[PDB]
Design an enzyme around this catalytic site. Structure first.
Site, PDB file in Angstrom:
ATOM      1  CE  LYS D  13      -8.176   5.249  -5.955  1.00 31.34           C
ATOM      2  NZ  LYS D  13      -7.104   5.542  -6.926  1.00 31.34           N
ATOM      3  CD  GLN D  48     -11.065  -1.293  -2.346  1.00 29.74           C
ATOM      4  OE1 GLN D  48     -10.147  -1.644  -3.102  1.00 29.74           O
ATOM      5  NE2 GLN D  48     -10.785  -1.269  -1.068  1.00 29.74           N
TER       6      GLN D  48
END
EC number: 1.5.1.3
Lengths: 59, 59, 59, 59
Positions: D13, D48
């Site tokens: 991320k 995720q």
């Protein structure tokens, strides 16, 4: 209350998909009458929620 | 405390991915100092967590 | 390949937490060698991921 | 296709909640026309999903 864990306890998933870090919240539904939010210690800011039976406290 | 929502409030996501249902818990991290768990009213037992700024209360 | 579902199939969770909507993707790990992403039909834009054994196709 | 990442790329991320590990799948919705599933390298088995704009490849 009769809660198993408190804010700040260090916990991990017992089995299956791994997760480890601090208790940062709680939730309650009919399916999960005692659930916890856990912030990963590896991935700051990422939180996942699990039923109490999936988690165990560690030092 | 100064919490925006309480248990049982009906809320929805304001924007982007949709979600709607009842507040069923809370969480607090540095990134999300005020967060809520919301059980979908459409999908019983499914819970997602969001920051307060992403949610709004409905009747 | 030998995939159980294809893009656009309508599926639901068999048990426990509910979810229902269209297959919108796939994933593969050692723990979940055949997994699917499902966009809720009730909550547009919200996607959850599950192992194939948790899902069943519906009309 | 024109995909940004491939299976096995190591990504993280860019901002906000952290996540890091390998691409293990993909998904496509109207809100997220190019999305990826990422298995954490810290928490094996935990996956995720994120839009491509949230992720960047690392060595």
């Amino acid at each position: 209350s009769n809660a198993t864990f408190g804010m700040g306890d260090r916990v991990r998933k017992k089995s299956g998909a791994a997760w480890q870090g601090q208790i940062v919240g709680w939730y309650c539904t009919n399916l999960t009458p005692e659930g916890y939010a856990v912030e990963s210690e590896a991935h700051p800011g990422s939180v996942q929620i699990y039923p109490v039976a999936a988690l165990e406290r560690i030092n």
